[PDB]
Symmetry: C4
């Protein structure tokens, strides 16, 4: 945690994974199994 910019990196990473997560489900709509 020496670099303060780490907080921005981790935050962006989390928001990035969650962004594609919701999007993927959105486009998929139905679970389809």
């Amino acid at each position: 945690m020496f670099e303060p910019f780490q907080i921005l990196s981790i935050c962006s990473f989390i928001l990035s994974a969650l962004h594609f997560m919701a999007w993927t489900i959105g486009h998929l709509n139905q679970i389809k199994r």
Copy 2:
């Protein structure tokens, strides 16, 4: 405000919260209460 990169961090954060804000409402469409 020692680090100049802070301006980019704060800006992104604000734009991030506002991005999900509009999106959430968009997907929700109706208030539903």
Copy 3:
């Protein structure tokens, strides 16, 4: 241009303005005048 991170800041800024630009038009659909 002393800070190299500037390139990432400027790029993100440009992509941010263009992102909301297309989105706004997308949601608006019709020009409506």
Copy 4:
């Protein structure tokens, strides 16, 4: 690779190009040729 923030820059760049890539196809829907 002297600057550690480079990893975040490269990652964002890749995710940015892939984001617009899928979006463009999404809006286009049909290939149209």
